[PDB]
Design goal:
Chain C: It is found in: Golgi apparatus, cis-Golgi network; Endoplasmic reticulum; Preautophagosomal structure. Chain C: It holds the Pfam family Sybindin. Chain B contains 7 helices and 7 strands. Chain B is 45% helix and 11% strand. In chain B, a hairpin with a 2-residue loop joins strand 2 (39-41) and strand 3 (44-46). By secondary structure, chain C is an alpha+beta fold. Chain C is 28% helix and 17% strand. Chain D contains 3 helices and 5 strands. Chain D has a 5-stranded antiparallel sheet, sandwiched between helices. Classes of the chains: A alpha+beta (184), B alpha+beta (202), C alpha+beta (151), D alpha+beta (166). Chains in contact: A-B, A-C, B-C, C-D. Chain C binds chain D through residues 3-4, 19-21, 23, 34, 37-38, 40-41, 44-45, 47-49, 51-55, 59-69, 85, 88, and chain D through 27, 32, 36, 39-40, 42-43, 46-50, 52-54, 61, 80, 82-94, 110, 116, 119. Strand 3 of chain C pairs antiparallel with strand 3 (86-91) of chain D.
Chain lengths: 184, 202, 151, 166
């Protein structure tokens, strides 16, 4: 009944496979491709990762809505509820936590505990200060939320791999999309 | 025997596997060496294409640029194949030692375990010419069930499916070159007999 | 009873339509007859449903019954509509329409990279009258495999 | 079955009568009921307009009599004047029962009960409120034609009918 109960409930009728030894090294191999093809550029790789993320998030939102039938969200309470309590539950077997909203509640942050996209990577010295790793997630959280009629913008703040501070993602409502009704 | 160790969904991996191909087309057609879209970032702009238009750009691709694409697909399959084989090492399969003198004994490894790990099922048939040429078979290749053919235009649909086959070419090439060397290895079609693709190796 | 079946869009274009009694399945004499005015009916009764809503959760329309026929409908959260017409012999078809959404549209259109996701090909004439293609080899075959055993 | 909000519209315009009675609350009523009544007036014509390929006949279009109310108003099964027109609407929170009359005048009962026989008891109840409309508004000399209902007597003639229903 609750959004915890549905997100845990889909794990009794979801086809599954191993989270190490596949799906970590897929992302690692494509980021190795982007690193070696741009001659170790550290910011264009974020752009191409965010592009491929936007495309996979726009293609993934339909499977999320068909897997559990839910009404269209409207604020950053229901999105902050639905994300952290079923979406990463049924796609990554994890659950992040929500903190650091503003006074008008027009933002929040997305502190993640066990990111399964970067398990024992330890990025080298030059990439440690000018590269973000998990930009496929920021692309997904742009492209998924842009198709439920909300413009959005989702950005990393810090992550474990280069920094002592945790893995978190900042996010702004950036207005609500207007559905276009008439003929003209 | 029944190991229940941590896991994620099959679907997000299968669709990431499917969008590795327009990732390769996007990384080649945009190498940044000096209709599309545009997005808004903070003091920053990206400009993208969508996937099916890029597969249609592969339909209008240059011939030498097409084989310049297909080296990258077997390269990325090669990387994930050698690393995935290296993790299989933890399994401690008792078949093989090194350099594969008995080549079919590790063909009895790949069909039993590697295709089980990537695609959830065994390779259903393997036929053996004894000159090193081994004849793979599977009735339903798993990441092309979701690729819908269009209405009565299957001659385009074959040409737009078979560049997704270079990833398991990379898989079996990478697990062979994790065990020592490189020899010739190609694709087939093999129209199935009861309601997908075949592979040759040395 | 499944006399007709239509698919609408986030950008409000009829993108797929099926007519019963072995009628045309293509998206071209059946084009724009009932397509805009059926959108006007579903949009209007949805708008007065959303205007008169109490509670935390807004409600959505399920069925519209006439004397002749009955209309079952289903919305997504992304703005895509499944509608179907029957003749009062059976009760509500929201299980059937959600099975269509969960087993045919996602399996052979959305996660199908090879056809586009529902959209207008970057038109400024995305306000209406954009004819589109949700035709496939296998989508219509599994759809008529499911739908035709009930009549 | 159970009726919770009553609406009487014009045959050719915005509505004449509206009561959100027996909901012990305040909901908005000002100037959006005219807009929604005009859209019901439009989409009755739109819902009649499209034809599925039936091409048969009434082989029908007649209920019975459940003794709804409280000497009733009629003791026999009767007939219907909307063969091809909207009859109910069904949502999550409410079902709206509509019944029009042969002169073109329609009557709307928004019912908060959730999810065949409901059509029978609805058509019987709305024919009875058509009878009280004819017997208590059309007889009034102060009531001009196609104006909002001002009769205080029609109020406790219908409040007692609804509270006799449940």
């Amino acid at each position: 009944r609750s959004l915890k109960a549905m997100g845990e409930e889909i794990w009794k009728n979801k086809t599954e496979k191993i989270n190490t030894e596949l799906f970590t090294l897929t992302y690692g191999s494509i980021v190795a491709q982007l690193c070696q093809d741009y001659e170790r550029d550290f910011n264009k790789v974020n752009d191409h990762l965010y592009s491929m993320g936007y495309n996979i998030g726009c293609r993934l939102i339909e499977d999320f809505l068909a897997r559990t039938a839910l009404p269209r969200c409207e604020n950053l309470v229901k999105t902050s509820e639905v994300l952290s309590k079923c979406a990463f539950k049924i796609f990554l077997n994890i659950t992040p936590n929500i903190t650091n909203w503003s006074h008008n509640k027009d933002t929040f942050s997305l502190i993640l505990d066990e990111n399964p996209l970067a398990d024992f990577v330890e990025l080298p010295m030059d990439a440690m200060k000018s590269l973000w790793y998990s930009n496929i997630l920021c692309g997904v959280l742009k492209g998924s939320l842009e198709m439920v009629q909300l413009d959005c913008d989702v950005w990393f703040v810090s992550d474990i791999l280069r920094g002592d501070s945790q893995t978190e993602i900042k996010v702004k409502l950036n207005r609500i999309l207007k559905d276009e009704i008439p003929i003209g | 025997f029944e190991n229940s160790l941590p896991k994620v969904s099959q679907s997000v991996y299968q669709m990431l596997l499917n969008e590795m191909v327009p990732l390769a087309m996007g990384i080649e057609r945009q190498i940044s060496g000096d209709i599309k879209r545009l997005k808004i970032e903070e003091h920053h702009t990206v400009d993208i294409i969508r996937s099916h238009n890029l597969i249609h750009e592969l339909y209008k691709a240059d011939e030498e640029e097409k084989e310049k694409v297909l080296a990258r697909l077997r390269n990325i399959g090669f990387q994930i194949g050698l690393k995935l084989s290296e993790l299989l090492i933890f399994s401690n399969n008792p078949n093989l030692k090194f350099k594969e003198m008995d080549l079919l004994l590790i063909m009895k490894f790949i069909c039993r375990d590697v295709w089980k790990q990537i695609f959830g099922k065994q390779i259903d048939n393997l036929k053996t010419n004894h000159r090193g040429t081994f004849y793979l078979l599977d009735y339903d290749y798993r990441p092309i069930q979701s690729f819908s053919l269009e209405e009565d235009a299957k001659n385009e649909e074959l040409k737009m499916i078979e560049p997704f086959l270079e990833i398991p070419v990379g898989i079996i090439r990478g697990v062979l070159s994790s065990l020592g060397y490189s020899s010739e290895e190609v694709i087939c079609l093999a129209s199935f007999i009861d309601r997908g693709v075949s592979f040759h190796v040395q | 009873g499944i006399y007709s079946f239509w698919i609408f869009d986030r950008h409000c274009n009829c993108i797929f339509d099926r007519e019963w009694t072995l009628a045309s399945n293509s998206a071209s004499k059946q084009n724009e007859e009932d397509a805009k005015l059926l959108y006007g009916m579903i949009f209007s009764l949805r708008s007065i449903t959303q205007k008169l809503s109490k509670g935390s959760v807004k409600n959505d329309i399920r069925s519209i019954s006439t004397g002749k026929y009955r209309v079952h409908t289903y919305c997504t959260a992304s703005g895509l509509w499944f509608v179907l017409l029957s003749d009062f012999k059976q009760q509500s078809y929201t299980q059937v329409l959600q099975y269509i959404y969960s087993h045919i549209y996602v399996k052979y259109v959305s996660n199908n990279l090879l056809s586009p996701y529902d959209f207008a090909e970057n038109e400024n004439e995305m306000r209406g009258q954009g004819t589109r293609k949700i035709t496939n080899r296998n989508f219509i075959s599994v759809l008529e495999s499911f739908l035709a055993p009930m009549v | 079955m159970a009726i919770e909000t009553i609406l009487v519209i014009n045959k050719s315009g915005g509505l004449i009568y509206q009561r959100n009675f027996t909901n012990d609350e305040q909901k908005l009523n000002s100037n959006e009921y005219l807009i929604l009544a005009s859209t019901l007036h439009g989409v009755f014509a739109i819902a009649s307009q499209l034809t599925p390929k039936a091409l048969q006949l009434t082989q029908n279009t007649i209920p019975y009599i459940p003794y709804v109310g409280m000497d009733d108003f009629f003791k026999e099964p009767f007939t219907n004047w909307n063969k091809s027109g909207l009859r109910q609407l069904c949502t999550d929170q409410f079902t709206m029962f509509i019944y029009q009359t042969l002169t073109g005048l329609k009557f709307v009962a928004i019912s908060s009960s959730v999810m065949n026989l409901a059509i029978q008891i609805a058509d019987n109840f709305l024919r009875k409120v058509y009878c009280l409309y004819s017997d208590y508004v059309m007889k009034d000399p102060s009531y001009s034609m196609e104006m909002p209902i001002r009769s205080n007597l029609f109020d406790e003639k219908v409040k007692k009918m609804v509270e006799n229903l449940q």
